[PDB]
Amino acid sequence: HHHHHSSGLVPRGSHMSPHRPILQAGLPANTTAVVGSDVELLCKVYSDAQPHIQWLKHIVINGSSFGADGFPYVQVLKTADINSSEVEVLYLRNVSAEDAGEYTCLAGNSIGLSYQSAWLTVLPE
Amino acid sequence: GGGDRRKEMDKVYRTAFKRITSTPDKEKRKEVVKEATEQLRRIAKDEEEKKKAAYMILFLKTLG
């Protein structure tokens, strides 16, 4: 087997190669909200190399989140140059029916780009 | 097929990501994005790679 001092991520500047960012499973999570309330989506990004954060919202046109060609309608909400030592947050204040749909968190470094998604459901009051 | 496609798409990302984060000249960044866009749409065949191509272009386009 393999015996090392740490089973965590490879330290920055080590003989081990760096990897693409790792997004923790379950974040963002599918949340449900009532109109007018505030919603916060999380995204825990692990990375040795510097990653850039990006939040998108999937846009629906004619009942479809994809174009006639097949590329997704997405809207850039937030970007960041470095990941946090805590967590990444997307603040959705005073949510309405139009805020519902698919939200995607993205983190990419010198190696790759990783992305996870979640669905926000908005119910009436 | 699909495996060789995603490997080719990763090479385009790393090559583009290295240039955007290196020079701050917005004109040179737009040229690498344009170049990365043309190669990425040619490799993409199914919906998983098309969404992945769209995601990477916007990631590099909005890179600080």
Author numbering:
A (entry chain A): 229 to 353
B (entry chain B): -2 to 61
Question: How is this structure described in the published paper?
Answer:
The design of proteins that bind to a specific site on the surface of a target protein using no information other than the three-dimensional structure of the target remains a challenge. Here we describe a general solution to this problem that starts with a broad exploration of the vast space of possible binding modes to a selected region of a protein surface, and then intensifies the search in the vicinity of the most promising binding modes. We demonstrate the broad applicability of this approach through the de novo design of binding proteins to 12 diverse protein targets with different shapes and surface properties. Biophysical characterization shows that the binders, which are all smaller than 65 amino acids, are hyperstable and, following experimental optimization, bind their targets with nanomolar to picomolar affinities.
We succeeded in solving crystal structures of five of the binder–target complexes, and all five closely match the corresponding computational design models.
